[PDB]
Symmetry: D3
Subunit: 253 residues, 6 copies
């Protein structure tokens, strides 16, 4: 078997990828999302009740479908990153990255020694298909994609330094965390926050990195796509389930 090609990583340079957030924390729900045709699915290990074992079930569900899986760990924890790579997550989204030093550690966390610090256990890993990918330890690094989130004042204070880190493939803006950090908690739509988001996207792309964001607001998501943003998540499974059920009940009250 040849290593699974990371099409998400390649497409950061060739197209704009439409994403769906997956926080229903279940292999069955992840498969429903996988049937829709999103370019990427974000399995959320930060804000949904997921662990390594439930994330594995969802990677297994999604794997039969063309949608590319991206996993968000609860934090930039090196041993947790090791665990998510070995169950076969090829793209990671690291929340709350705030310095070039932290970004560089996340780069090393995703790469094998001697250049990085990813723990080596290919005999046990779904990532290598238990060494059925015979050259995995030589071909693994090439298909791993590292995305970091800028979503705090400290992240914005270190943006230019993070953008000079080789191995950071993309910077994703978190509007909820960022609007809260800016003293506009629950009000990311305010011009003060949106002007910072637009300037941040423009700086990310000017440094030759992919820019990403999540917005469930169709107008904002379309504006971000018009600006060239490479990976845009346009909704959240929990939100869509709740709103679809509420909108239906409202027709009958």
């Amino acid at each position: 078997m040849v290593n699974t090609v990371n099409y998400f990583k390649q497409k950061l340079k060739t197209e704009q990828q439409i994403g769906m957030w997956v926080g229903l924390a279940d292999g069955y729900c992840a498969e429903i999302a996988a049937n829709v045709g999103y370019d990427w699915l974000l399995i959320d290990g930060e804000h949904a009740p997921n662990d390594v074992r439930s994330i594995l079930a969802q990677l297994q569900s999604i794997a039969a479908y063309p949608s590319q899986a991206v996993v968000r760990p609860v934090s930039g924890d090196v041993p947790l990153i090791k665990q998510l790579l070995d169950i076969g997550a090829q793209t990671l989204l690291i929340p709350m990255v705030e310095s070039a030093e932290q970004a560089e550690l996340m780069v090393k966390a995703t790469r094998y020694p001697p250049e990085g610090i990813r723990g080596v256990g290919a005999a046990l890993a779904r990532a290598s298909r238990w060494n059925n990918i015979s050259d995995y330890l030589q071909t693994a690094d090439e298909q791993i994609c590292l995305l970091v989130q800028v979503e705090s004042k400290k992240g914005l204070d270190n943006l230019d330094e993070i953008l000079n880190v080789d191995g950071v493939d993309g910077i994703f803006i978190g509007p909820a965390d960022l609007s809260a950090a800016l003293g506009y908690r629950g009000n990311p739509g305010h011009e003060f926050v949106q002007n910072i988001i637009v300037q941040t996207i423009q700086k990310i792309r000017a440094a030759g990195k992919a820019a990403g964001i999540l917005s469930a607001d169709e107008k904002l998501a379309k504006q971000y796509l018009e600006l060239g943003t490479e990976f845009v998540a346009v909704g959240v499974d929990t939100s869509l389930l709740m709103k679809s059920m509420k909108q239906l009940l409202s027709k009958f009250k």
Copy 2:
């Protein structure tokens, strides 16, 4: 503690109850549905991948919310009915009921001896809260609600006989199974099928039983409500999740 009052059962005689089908087969998804404000939630043990233990998890999730739980077992199996009653399901929907003899057996299956055949194990049952409901064995039968499905030609051939069974609280029409049985599989909206459904609702209510149905078609659901139908399910969680995600992607293709 006093036995949990079956408000669904009482409301069969006082109002029209709006329902949501729950087939995501998970305590977390069932809780999301429980927050919307449906009069009843149908935990589907027939057409969703559920078992006694996953149904228990969903009963526990939903129990904090006013929505009334209704459980559909995979068939009219007396021992499975016993298991679902003991985990605390107070309303059952029995699929593919086809004779007064089968309906009478379902009545007995839901009632304690000596009048019925429900196995007695109150020390172990969530239904009795492990005997924290001190008079459960005296008060249980009063709060159990039995619904049977008519959804085959043989069911229609025995409709008047089923409607004379004391202990059948409601008859629910299954349009998918019924349209297939009539040789209109996938086409319940045909006049041939709909004229039979309307006639059947009228006969159910004329016999003093509650009538029920599911339709994700807003026009048909509203027509059934205009006809007086007492318990109408107006959508399905799996369907709403898939459609909401597809409609969103179509805005960005």
Copy 3:
């Protein structure tokens, strides 16, 4: 490896075995019960929310301890009996047995062809330790113990016929089901029910079969032990957990 000796089965002829009912439906809770020193533990697949997979977890927990496991299936279902034997349950308690014909079918359900109808799949079974017990198919039948419950008027109407069935090792009286069947639901302590229970124990033992019963009432359990009853369950984990927590709170209200 030699087949696991069924000490419960041997001890039916040599001592009085004290039992604990296990309805907490969990490997962790079953292990806590296994540490106490009961002669037998009843994993309840009838009145607790158990399935083949949760019963397996509990057999695995209990297996490190001297307590003998007895499993109760939800009914006398031949294919379910096959499944419980292959995960390694060596003693079964069949609820609501009502005829010698049904008892004879339960005997055959527990024995390999050609004499019985137990499905053969030793390569897959924990019972054979996946054929690490090399002579399992020759030694299995000898260590299987069949217990049947008499707990209805029909069971009492067929008691002498059930007691003449070769392969029925023990008859267990269910006081909850039996008192309900007799029109004394929730009142097994009444003399009318107790006189029938005592006569039934005396007839079971006179026919050379082991007699069994459950009572959480210490006086009744001691009376049953004085009468020679071979397997007496003296309490229920769910009941003891609830009562211990209530009694403690009552000291502080």
Copy 4:
């Protein structure tokens, strides 16, 4: 989306398919087996500790790989067959089929009304991908494959009658059950049993049905393949795991 093509079913007429028995009862273990390249994988719901939910996890794991899934239910139970078809199993292996009447019921159990009795719930089914396969109710029946086991004296007594059932795609011989039924329990390799197995394969193929069998004995498996047997399982995951670990330890004792 078009309905998943059942390549196993097509290949019954064009090649000899090599199978692996999957009884480790786990999505992770099923994926390991799926990477090897077997033509078919048998998810065993009869002799491994599986239920609808664990079988679903395994179908989801295997679905990313070319290996075709076949599911064996615990018995020819119509409602369980409905549940396994809805989670998306397209090929079923029914144990212990013993009459043309039972084989005909299994045919109807796998087909929609009005010609069959498969319950209709496409909105909830992974089989229809929750109606994302838009024409599922018209295209489903064509891709369902029914295999029945002949593995008892009564099955052999009804072989010619079972072989005349339209809709039975294959007859699979169970050597463990059959050798036990014949009074050679644990000794299927005896000439008395093997002559019956060879004669039975010849009759199945002479009637234009596919013949199948399991043997972990390489010589017997190769003999069955030389006889033209269409679907041959050549080993069992639990057996291979145990033997590989024992053989390794024996090098070091």
Copy 5:
């Protein structure tokens, strides 16, 4: 919907709340405890085999009952605190707190930016009921309760400094960890330890914070209640289950 009111937090100033430790690590066992009538239940993520997903199941079980849930994480880990708040734990008990600097970080860990560092993901959170609590991001902080444990010499060495931290609602004394730290492991009942515990309760209350403790010793628990201690846990589910089963067996040996 309005944010769930934290009655435990309010009652720290108005009454003495009686608690039960929940370490059976299971939604079913947590529900049994929830039925008893304790003022609070401690879901132990430090000393029972719990994770975010098993804690969620227990929050869902308990939520239908008046008992207030308190969750203990395995350590004062900021990302784990984020995960437990989002699944809807409103009161946290942080073990082994040893400085005002660590206590201040735990305060920030429980509050949204810009004043704290709690990660913002309300669309995904049971805490916000997936934004069905429409003003959650404005109302959340008010209903969060932070308890810290003093249970080491370093904790006692920083007691006055911890008691001056605004946002620490209560200090809980851990007698097991504290007696071990003092060189009296397994002997918290010694006067040397008890004089320190009483002095510590007095200092906690003198500083205007709530004092808490666990003791399964009825005399010590009543003494702590006489001293004004605001939140007293009086037993442990695992302990009560084991002791109740052992006491029963001892009546029959």
Copy 6:
């Protein structure tokens, strides 16, 4: 009950113990491995998808068998070490230990106060069998075994200092991590790596510590055993499952 004797720990001084790596992450698979007769089984929480709860299930499965369990946590995390000790793991293997300061912290992490920092919660712990081991807090420390991995250049740079740490019972060499660290990723069999491994084994034993290693290469494993290596793992369950299934298929292609 007396504390479970750690025979693995004792045998470090009296014999050479043969090990199997257990990464199938499942109680059922761990039991299969436990039946084979390995001296020790390594439950891998670093490179297999395990968490505290799945490791508990595996300890419960294995506990009925003489094979000694060793658990590898994902990293030398003090709170995770506490959790693994409380579920009853008596031998820990800490990956990537790189200093005497880190080794000394791991020693303290495994011992109760006042000499160590292991959190005290014996009422809740399987380790104490919920205090059914009445003297657990006095007898626990004696039966705990600490193994640390040297598998990086920094570990080799601190080998003599790690070997002087009292409480380190064994040093285990990780050939995958070490060969990668040395710039021979995937090529541990190179003489440059093997000469370092042999020298490292000789130094470990010269300091009076137990030496350990994993190799699935029979020749290398036998060489390490001839050198006196005290604990040698000779294979991996995931590898043996994959290779056994591939080797079988290759006989039939």
